[PDB]
């Protein structure tokens, strides 16, 4: 019409990333020429964590310490042996849309009060041995929920298949550092995990037992 | 000064996404430390709509169905075809900043009030018949413009100079679902576009009847 | 527990983008299903500018200037240069995590009162001459901070080390017009600088007079 | 007192329906000049409906179609049936207030957004058959109870003693048409109730075995 | 005009029963579609009130008493005696737009605090000696003027021409009974009288001493 | 559900009157348990003007003056009349709800401000006479619209059939006073009208030429 | 002090017109750079009404009638008179700080609604007949207090010697006009006065009865 | 009455300036001790501008400019010769109020920001030939209308009549000044016009062709 | 435009006092029909003041003292003295907007709580004593700046020239008298000045040694 005052939604997707319109978001319960993006956890996709392993550090101030340290060849032995244990069958046409290391902190002790604080870095080559501790230099901070999340992206039988492949080509070995601002040392628990979002295609067609029909 | 209480507006570009800050954008008739992207049909750049279908597809509850299942070489033939049809002659160098399959959707009958859901997937290799039927799975929600919309990102006189120069790579062949979140079956009509975002470069510089001067 | 009611940060990282949940963000002093990107500079990791030049440009309405017209092996001499001489020692591992061609922009006399308008376009081969001056074309709008930002992302001895190791595939050889919105010529006086964003992982150790110990 | 202040509740009753004044029901956690009716089936009186039957009609836009068309005596022998065989024994002395037709609409599908809308007349003689389909013109328009109650108003062993005691002229053989205002053919669900609102007045006396005392 | 922002006043009479619309109520220092009934002692016509008698009843938790039995013949005696020794000589055309039987209540003790009930009948035939004390069956509800206001509705000589006119078939012979939502028995002092209201159409003339002129 | 938080609109109909629960008319862009009447010329049925006469009255201070003086035989006559040669042919099932006396008044010269006043009286014998001129006594007093609308509630081909099947006996006889609560003379300009509302049962049926089909 | 939040007072006179800062006006229970005039009759200095007479006139709509017609020897004559058998003895030293020819004006029926209008001229010589009757051009409009009120600024034993000083030079002999903004002629009734401002200097003295001590 | 509390309107007349209460000001749609004066041209008489010339001028910063320096009878010749020339025939008595030398000021390019400043002088004797160019000093800030207005103040043939009667004596001969508060020198147009308030005395009589009646 | 929403400035002079309109000084951080006056120390011109003496005054309640008392040939010897003495050189071309004579008022003691009170005279002929003391008569209330500001108004080498030029004809010998509202003798410190407002033109030239060039 000539004249119009309602806000309509609208959606764009940008390599697996949704986004919204900011005032259709804003009206939940100009500002409409913007848009911001979808919590990939919260977004399209299943979400499946696979949880690699705990570790404590304990943590000098000023400093971070290296949370894992694996060689390319056992990040991908890793990753693909807990993902295809956790999978089979993978019995429809799926995409794996991204992956995202997932570092989970805590304190040991109770009654701290401190944020957490972290740095990564995605490697290609293996050659290269991280520092165990460095010094805080314009890190990221972690918000409340305690969880640094670092996607990693830019079928097989066997994990030789998988190397031969080179499918390992299509996502980041990470490291990752994590401190705190405290002015004290700090005892943190980690938990380490690799978040896929996965869009499945499940066709329209039931199971049967054999033989159909 | 020793002192500001303004907020000021500042921009990024990435890879031809642009951004301005939060408390600019809220301030239009801490924030400031936040970025939003500008929607992209009306930021930087023309628009150019290429239409290239209608489609009627009848949908069930918690089913989406296959909206377009070209081949790699037809959907490039389609592509290119429709846009050099539509665009020559290209007078001034320009570049495309990205291309959109957007899907637009609409009930067939009145009265009814459900909302859109839609997947898609980027391929790359036409070795892969989709298929028709998928049942719904974590889908994207389409926003009441009833318009999915996807980038397909990352001056040739004939198709076979286009695929000669493997032009093709430079973009996803895209294949999409479209369903709702009704508990009957919904008729929809929908229409498939591609809206390309083309930055002009053009002289300052006028149009002469031969010969010039 | 079986009812919450308060708002949780969250924190993700996309190829050295951070971002925060949209709630969390709000509350500094469903929304929460939406995040929103850090301002580069203000957000993790070092700021490096490098000050390249400055230009003067007379620029009538409705069109753009060129700021920049180097031949790629010269963008790439004067980045690398530039870069090398202010660094060195590098002393520690660091990442560059993007580089910025940024361009600030101010009028040459006072009481004149238009916003800026910018152009850019990212090059790979050197082979193309840009025009001098262009029409206004759906242009970016620059904001109050009078600036320009572009990112430009996606250890040597010598620049010829650099070239050798072909690194400048990390990063376009940007082109970038400025003009404004202004209905008479306006002088204009251009500053164009790159800004790096680093990431340095400096160890915990102390420097020591040799011999150590 | 020379002055007052706060509003003091006032009721009145005009043939069995109940009034507050305005003020008073606003202040419930000059308008008090006025008055407001109470919703008789939430009001004085106790609620007796009876379900007579179920009906699916399917109506087509800008029609209504009729819902019952019972001859007189049909109509007084059902109400009379259904009423005593609900009641029997009627205990104490009571007064039938009033007796509302009821008629409840619902959808066959979901997913539909429509309103529904009613007309009614009320008939003294069967000496007339309805049109079983009509035109809507400046009907009365459903609330989103989907019920449209009409009041019907202005001790017997046999429906033939009720007849002879003309018992019949005391309430309106209703017929009534039901559309909606959708601009499609909509299937609808419908449900013909008489709501009875009884006064009773049961003295203050206990129920003993035989003989009493 | 073209455009209408402001509430006006519109009025209707139903049968002595006089309305306004609700929004010009609601704005006196969409809604405009619907009316609000006058106070009918606050509303237009005479105020007359006949009080008969006073009576006091002690009304045990979850019951009510009787009020007034009166036989019709005795009921429209005292109407008519009480009515016409008030009123005579009654100068002038006038119509009696309804009469109220007003239980007006009060406890006769200080220091309760509970809400008054009641519920009436309106009879036609003498023929019926109702209980002096009943159960309390979904009542009505006194408010805080401590009235229960009945309408009975729907220029003699002398009584016996009053009945001979019939007359008495224009208004019910009502019974009444009050009680309390008291957990204790509660003395209470109670007042009934007639509020008739009257239309009077005194003409505009002087009354002069006789002989006139 | 165990809680509910939301308004529903219900109605009811009472003798063609028809009603809406007061919270759904409130909420239109406990209070639910109370009704408000639709206006009824904006209520369901047609609305028909029939306009019978103007006329020029001339009133006193605290004084009105008779509008229409007609005997019933010619009160009949002219509704009659008027209503048949207006809708002949009447082609359809209809029931007349309603018909209302409508007063409208205006001032007749500009620059006054006063409000209007008003009083009827619904006549059975056309034996009486009324005053020309009466006295104010608790009167109607009329909104903004300057109109006294007033129900007189409560097929034929000659007037003389009308008589026969006393169809007269449906509807009052009305006598109307109006003045104003002015303190000088004021003349006033009456237009006097019935308005019909009229309920239309038109079967689904069009217009043939004949023969049909 | 370096810093200051709180507005001060302050007065300033221009020829016997008083004025006080805006702000100072405002806070009474940058602005404050402005000034506003105190009321003449509410500000210093003593008000003394002498009312001349009254005169009644039938004003036609868009015209104004002439009010006054004296020669400037009456109107000398009248002012001094009036003025001197008002005052006498004067007993102290005085200012007249100005004179005000004041006009009020009221109608003489109730129940009309109209602004007043008013226009004036300030003469030098009584040479000049005035019209009595003009049209109503860009006129005075009087406010709700329905005064108008002219400034005329800008001893004597007799008005000969009032004559002989000269005095009449002090004040100018006005001219007034008097219409209404009404659609009918309007009867208005005026008082026409003189309000002279007087600034008294009484010494601090005592009267004695004589002889005095 | 014994209590008050609306607002009155009042109004004064000085020199043919109106004056308001400011209280009424307000309420519009203690303080009321207070007047403000009515915008002449918004207020009482007719407009006339006689445009006179237009005129460009450079104004360097802090410096302003010399708009018109007439001698005194040029000033005179050129004042009567266009006002006459406009007014003739002057058909009925009427009073110059007031004569305003207005002075409207614009950029002569756009995309400027300043405010304009401005000084004059109402000189006497033709006896001082202006500086051309002044020093800013305590100016007077002109608003965003870009319109310094100055009252001049404080029937003939020819202009010769017009000086013979030293009618040339009742108004002053200005001098004005404009620069800006630029930092750059500005081009500015400059129109330059009076505009007179005349108070017309029309009588109530129409122009009749010779000869009448 | 056809519609307009915001407020715009404009200003007025008269004989130097410069207003501006209402909104626009309210809106600074219908009313724009009215305009304010600027306070005149605050507005357009220099401010030059000139403190004449101290005195102490002790005034008895509902009293004022005079507080001086010169002959005229004294204040216009003092005023011309103190402005000649302070001033010369007086360099350029100038005017004398307007002269006040300004009371500063303080008191003696401190935690007294008071207003100042005040009333002046402009006299012409020093024939006249005043009295030394008088009593309050509707007197100036002086705001809390305890100052009392009173415009005087309406180049030469010595006071006789300036007596011989009649120059003194041009502002009036003001005396003035102050006391307090409070209900004991107070004692005051008073500071008599006379603020100047002067509007100079200086010549763009600069002041060069001699000979220049």
């Not at 894992?68 to 060849?73: A, F, Y």
């Not at 929920?145 to 990470?174: C, H, M």
Request: glycine share 4%.
């Amino acid at each position: 019409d000539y004249s119009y005052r309602p806000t309509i939604g609208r959606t764009y997707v940008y390599d697996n990333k949704y986004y919204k319109n900011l005032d259709a978001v804003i009206k939940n319960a100009p500002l409409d020429n913007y848009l911001v993006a979808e919590d990939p956890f919260l977004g399209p996709g299943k979400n499946q964590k696979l949880t690699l392993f705990k570790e404590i550090r304990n943590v000098k101030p000023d400093t971070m310490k290296l949370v894992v340290g694996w060689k390319g060849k056992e990040f991908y032995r890793e990753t693909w042996t807990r993902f295809m244990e956790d999978s089979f069958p993978i019995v429809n046409d799926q995409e794996v849309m991204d992956v995202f290391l997932v570092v989970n902190m805590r304190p040991t002790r109770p009654n701290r009060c401190y944020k957490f604080l972290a740095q990564h870095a995605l490697r290609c080559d293996p050659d290269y041995v991280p520092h165990d501790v460095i010094r805080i230099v314009e890190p990221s901070w972690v918000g409340s929920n305690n969880e640094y999340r670092i996607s990693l992206a830019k079928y097989t039988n066997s994990f030789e298949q998988f190397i031969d492949r080179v499918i390992w080509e299509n996502f980041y070995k990470p490291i990752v550092y994590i401190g705190t601002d405290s002015a004290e040392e700090e005892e943190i628990l980690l938990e380490v995990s690799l978040v896929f979002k996965v869009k499945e295609f499940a066709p329209d067609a039931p199971l049967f037992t054999g033989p159909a029909y």
